[PDB]
Amino acid sequence: KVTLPDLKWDFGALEPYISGQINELHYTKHHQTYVNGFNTAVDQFQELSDLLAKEPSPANARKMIAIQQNIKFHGGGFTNHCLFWENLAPESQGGGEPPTGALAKAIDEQFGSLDELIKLTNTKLAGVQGSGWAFIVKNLSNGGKLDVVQTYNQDTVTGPLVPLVAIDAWEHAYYLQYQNKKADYFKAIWNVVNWKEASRRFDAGKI
Amino acid sequence: KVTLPDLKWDFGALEPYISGQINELHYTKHHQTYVNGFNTAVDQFQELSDLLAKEPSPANARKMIAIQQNIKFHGGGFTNHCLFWENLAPESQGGGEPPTGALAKAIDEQFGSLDELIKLTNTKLAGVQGSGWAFIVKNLSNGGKLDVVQTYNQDTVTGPLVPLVAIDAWEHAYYLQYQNKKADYFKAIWNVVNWKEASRRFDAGK
Amino acid sequence: KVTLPDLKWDFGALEPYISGQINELHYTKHHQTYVNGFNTAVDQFQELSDLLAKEPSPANARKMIAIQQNIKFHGGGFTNHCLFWENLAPESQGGGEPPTGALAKAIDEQFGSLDELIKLTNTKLAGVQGSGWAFIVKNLSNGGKLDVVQTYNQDTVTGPLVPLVAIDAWEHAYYLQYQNKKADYFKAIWNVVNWKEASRRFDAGK
Amino acid sequence: KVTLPDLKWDFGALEPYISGQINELHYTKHHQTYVNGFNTAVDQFQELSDLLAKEPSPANARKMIAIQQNIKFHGGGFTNHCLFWENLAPESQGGGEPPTGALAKAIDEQFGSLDELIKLTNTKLAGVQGSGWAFIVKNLSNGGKLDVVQTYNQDTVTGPLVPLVAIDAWEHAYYLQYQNKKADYFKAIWNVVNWKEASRRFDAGKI
Ligand SMILES: [Mn+2]
Ligand SMILES: [Mn+2]
Numbered sequence A, D: 001k002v003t004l005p006d007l008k009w010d011f012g013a014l015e016p017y018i019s020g021q022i023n024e025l026h027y028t029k030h031h032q033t034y035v036n037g038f039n040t041a042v043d044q045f046q047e048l049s050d051l052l053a054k055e056p057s058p059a060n061a062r063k064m065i066a067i068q069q070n071i072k073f074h075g076g077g078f079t080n081h082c083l084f085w086e087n088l089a090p091e092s093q094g095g096g097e098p099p100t101g102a103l104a105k106a107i108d109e110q111f112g113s114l115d116e117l118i119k120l121t122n123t124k125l126a127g128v129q130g131s132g133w134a135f136i137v138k139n140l141s142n143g144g145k146l147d148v149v150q151t152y153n154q155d156t157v158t159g160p161l162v163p164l165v166a167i168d169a170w171e172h173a174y175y176l177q178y179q180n181k182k183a184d185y186f187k188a189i190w191n192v193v194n195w196k197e198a199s200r201r202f203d204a205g206k207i
Numbered sequence B, C: 001k002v003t004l005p006d007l008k009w010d011f012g013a014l015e016p017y018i019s020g021q022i023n024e025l026h027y028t029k030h031h032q033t034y035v036n037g038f039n040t041a042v043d044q045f046q047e048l049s050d051l052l053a054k055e056p057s058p059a060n061a062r063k064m065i066a067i068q069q070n071i072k073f074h075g076g077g078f079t080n081h082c083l084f085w086e087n088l089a090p091e092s093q094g095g096g097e098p099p100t101g102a103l104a105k106a107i108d109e110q111f112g113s114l115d116e117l118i119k120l121t122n123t124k125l126a127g128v129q130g131s132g133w134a135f136i137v138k139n140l141s142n143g144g145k146l147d148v149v150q151t152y153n154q155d156t157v158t159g160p161l162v163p164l165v166a167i168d169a170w171e172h173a174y175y176l177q178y179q180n181k182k183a184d185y186f187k188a189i190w191n192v193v194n195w196k197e198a199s200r201r202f203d204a205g206k
C-alpha cells in the first residue's frame, strides 16, 4: 500500500519559481489521486488474479488486460511525482546549486556544461506535445551515459534508464502561475532543482 | 494459470484457405508463447505485489510498471487467439456460411449486405500498418451497433465492445502460404469464418 | 495559410460554465500556437518535398518523416479548436438547448435519451489519462451510427468518423476555474454546447 | 520520387543466414511497396497543400492529418530498408567482420565488447512485441554516445539519433527460414552485418 511521501520543504518554499498554491494542489490533490488509483488498481488485479486461478477464461484474462492500464498510469503518477518532489529544494536547502563529483564530470564531458544540458532539457520539455515529463537519465546499458528523454502522460523511465531529474510538463504543474507561458516555467524551475539528489541517484544507479 | 484451448477442428481442416502447416505453428508455437508469457507475467505481478507490500517505494512501483506491458501483450495474445480459433471452422462445420437471425438483420441494415461488411473488413485489415487485428464488434454503449475496429500488436477490444469476429493480420498468420500477398489471405479467410459463433456472440453480448 | 477563426460569441459569453479568462487564453494563446505551428509545418513540408524531388535520398526521406509529428499535432490542434468553438454557444444563442430533427431521433434510438449520451461522453472525458478530446461522431462506414470516441493530445477523428461535438479535455480548458475537478467541468460544459451545429454536422455528414 | 536502391550483393549472397527467397521477396515486394506508398503519400500531401493555400479550412487540414500517417509509415518503410541493405554484406564483402577505428573504440568503451553490444541488441529485438526494428545509434545530443533503440512498425530514428546498424524484426524478414524461431534469426544475422558501413555512418554522424 503506497502513501503520499513527506515533503522536505513547506508548500511555499519554492517561491517565486513555483507558487505555494500550485504545490499544495499538486501534492494534496493530483499526487494523492495517483496514490489512491495505484492502490485500487493493485487491489483489483489481486482480485482478478484469484478469479483467473479458479476460472482461467479469456473473459477473465480480458478483465486483467483492462486494469493494467490503471496500474501503469497510476503507478507512473505515483512514481514520477515522488521523484519530482525529491529533486526540488528551496535555495536554503541547496536548490539551484550545481552538481559536483562524478555527475558534474559526466555533464561537462557529454554536454559541455550544465547550462547546455539545461537548455537541451528545456527544448525537450517544450517538445512534449500533450501531457508528460522530461527526465535527465543515466543509461545503465550503454556504460552509464547521460541522456534526456521525454515521456507522455504518466509513462516513466524503467529498466536501464535511471531518472536523475524529473521535470513535470503537465499543465497542472504551472498553469495557475504561468498560464500558457510554459517556457517561463521550464526556465524558472532550475532555480529550485536539487542537484544533490540528482548526484545521489547518479552514484547509486537506482532510485 | 491459463492453457491452450481445445480446437474444434484438426490443423488441416481449414485447407486450402489456411494451410495446416500455418495452423500447427500458429497454435503450438505462437499461441503457446502468449500462454507462457501471460502465466509468467501474472506470477511476476504476484511477486512484485508482495515486494511492494514489504517496501512500497517508487523503486518497487517502477518494477511493477515494467511488467504491465507483458501482462497486456501476452494477455491480449492469449485472448485474441482464443477468439480467433472459435470463429474459424471448416465448411463441414458451417465455416463460410452466412449468418442468420438478428446478426444478419443488423448486418444488412447497417452495411447493405454481408459482402459489403466483408469488403469493409478487408479494407481495415489491409490498413493495419504493422502487426495487428481487425474485429467486427457489437458496441453495447451505442445501442448494440456493429462496427469494424483495428487493433495493433496484441491490443484487444474491451469495454462495451464485444468481438463477434476476430481476424489475425500478423504476418505469421499467412506468410508461409501467401507471403507478401496479404490481400489474398484476407479474401480467402471468409470461406472458413464461423458466422454461427459470431451470431452467438452477438446475441449474448459477451 | 491558416488563421484563427472568428468566434460567434464574446469571451465572457459562456459564464458561469466557462470563464471568460479561460476562453481568452484558450483562443488567443493556445489556438494561435497551433495555427502558427501548422503553418510552419506545412511550409517545411513544402521545402522538404522540393528537396526530396531533387534528391530522393533516405537522408531527405528521414527529414520528411521527422516533420510529420508537427503536421499531425498542430494540424489537429488547429482543427479540433475550430470544431470546439463552433459547437459552443451562450444560452442567448441557444447553447444548451437539446438537438432536434434527425440527430435527436438517432440519439433517442441509440442511447435512450440525451442525458444518457452526455453521461457516456463524460465517462470518456474522465477516461482520458493525459491530455485529449472526446468526440460524439457519426460513423459513415456502419450506416451512419452515433458513437463517442476518445483521442489523446491533438489526435482527431478523420475519414468516415464525422465529429458532431468536440469537447476539450486538456487541463488548459478548465484548470484556472475548476483546477483538479475536471468532472465538474465536464458536467458544466453541456450547458453551452451548440446542438444546433451538431445537428447541422450530422445532416451534412461532414 | 523515390526508387528501390541498387543492392551491393545478389539475393542468395547471405545464405545460409538469410535465404535468397527471403531477400528477393523482401526487396522486390516489401521494399517496393513502401517505395510506392511513400511516393503516393507525398503526392497526395502536395495536392492537399496546394488546395489548403486556396481553402485554408479545418476540412482540408483534417484531410492532411489523415495522409501524414502514410507519409510516416511508407517514408519509414523506404528509409529503414535502404539502411538495412547497406548494413548487410556477404562474408566475401566483409560481412560479419568487426568494426575498427573510432566506432570500435566507442563500442569497447561503452559496452565492454562487440559481443556485449550484440547481445544487448538481440535482447532489444526480442523485446519488440509486434512488428518493428532495433537500431544501434549514435546520439549527437549527448556528446555522440552509442545506444540501442527499439522502434515499432516502420517508425525510425530521426534528428540527433543517427542509425548505425538497422536490424529488421518484422516477421517477413525471417519467417520463411526461421518461422517462430526469431531468436535464431537475431543471432544469425550478425554473421552478415556490414560493420564497415556502420563505421562510416558513425564517422559521418549522418546517413
Ligand atoms: Mn503533476
Ligand atoms: Mn497470431
Ligand SMILES: [Mn+2]
Residues within 6 Å of the ligand: C026, C030, C081, C168, C170, C172, C173
Ligand atoms: Mn485546448
Ligand SMILES: [Mn+2]
Residues within 6 Å of the ligand: D026, D030, D081, D168, D170, D172, D173
Ligand atoms: Mn522488412
Ligand code: NA
Residues within 6 Å of the ligand: C177, C178, C179
Ligand atoms: Na474551483
